[PDB]
Structures are given as C-alpha cells and as structure tokens.
Structure 1
Amino acid sequence: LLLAALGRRELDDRDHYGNKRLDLAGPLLAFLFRGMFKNLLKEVRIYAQKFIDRGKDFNLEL
C-alpha cells in the first residue's frame, strides 16, 4: 500500500487475467459438495442426538 501511495509500484489492474481464476467444473462441484456434506453431517447429528438422548444405540444407515 505504501509503495502504491509513494508511486514506487503501479496500481494493480482489475482486468489482468493474471489476477483472475477460472472456476471450472471440479472446483464448482467441490463448493457444492462442501455445502451438501456439511448439511448431511448436520442431519446425522440431529438424528443421532435424538437417539443417544434416550440412551440407546442408533443405525447410521438410517
């Protein structure tokens, strides 16, 4: 920031493709999969909690 304010460096170009990244099928499906796996683990947490609160085992398949 000081180099830019002192004029010793050029401001960065927002449009330079060296400053950009292409979010392809893999990294996009990964974003989906993170959200969806988190939701799945949440649902598993509620389901298992409502069973262990009764002090008995539970079937992870269900």
Structure 2
Amino acid sequence: KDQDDRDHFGKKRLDLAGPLLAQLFKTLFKKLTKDIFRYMQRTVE
C-alpha cells in the first residue's frame, strides 16, 4: 500500500459559524455549571 497523503482534501474538514460557536458555547456553559455547583456548596440552608 502507498503511504497516506496528509494533503488529500477529502481527508480534511471545515469548521464554519456553527461548530466554532459549538466549541465556544460548550466551554462557557460548563463554566456556568461549575458556578451553579459552587453556589450550591455555599448554600448551607
């Protein structure tokens, strides 16, 4: 078999508005989840 070509355009992908926002959002949401858990600990009700 021939060595794989790293520059075959078919073995590449494009990340448009949606997936770039998906990455960003996930991180931010998880950062609010960690704050929701933090407020819960501080709530000694």
TM over 0.5: yes
CA distance in 2, matches of 1:15, 1:27: 22
Alpha-carbon RMSD across the aligned residues, in angstroms, is: 0.8
Query: Where does the alignment leave 5 or more consecutive residues of structure 2 unmatched?
Result: none
CA distance in 2, matches of 1:25, 1:11: 34
Report the count of equivalent residues: 45
CA distance in 2, matches of 1:34, 1:10: 39
Q: Tell me which protein shows more helix as a share of its residues.
A: 2
Give the letter for the 2:23 counterpart.
Answer: F
- When normalised by structure 1's length, the TM-score is 0.67
Query: Where does the alignment leave 5 or more consecutive residues of structure 1 unmatched?
Result: 1-8, 57-62
Question: Which is bigger in relative contact order (C-alpha 8 A, separation at least 6)?
Answer: 1
CA distance in 1, matches of 2:21, 2:42: 31
Moved over 4 A (4+): none
Identity percentage of aligned residues: 56
Residue number among 18, 36, 44 corresponding to 1:26 in the alignment: 18
